[PDB]
Amino acid sequence: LRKVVLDVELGREQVQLLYKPIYDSIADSNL
Amino acid sequence: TKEMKDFNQTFSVEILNKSIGESYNALLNHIHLSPIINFNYKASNKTAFK
Numbered sequence: 230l231r232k233v234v235l236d237v238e239l240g241r242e243q244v245q246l247l248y249k250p251i252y253d254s255i256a257d258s259n260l
Numbered sequence: 261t262k263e264m265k266d267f268n269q270t271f272s273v274e275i276l277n278k279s280i281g282e283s284y285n286a287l288l289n290h291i292h293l294s295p296i297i298n299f300n301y302k303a304s305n306k307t308a309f310k
Contacts, residue, residue: 259269 265271 258266 265273
């Protein structure tokens with residue numbers, strides 16, 4: 230018979246960058 | 261190491277290529293002139309100071 234999967238919501242949670250409002254970014258490959 | 265290339269300001273692959281080229285030219289000189297020098301010359305070839 231036909232095989233149908235229960236389309237459930239799994240997978241690990243996404244992680245966001247929370248530090249950004251605090252730190253002052255300095256971007257330079259010469260450092 | 262990647263850290264040595266990335267953190268060291270003066271180090272680069274350019275100086276490594278320079279060293280490779282210098283040693284290569286010296287190797288060519290040695291290969292093509294040491295047979296002339298190291299040869300055991302017979303008295304027929306040799307000429308005195310005179």
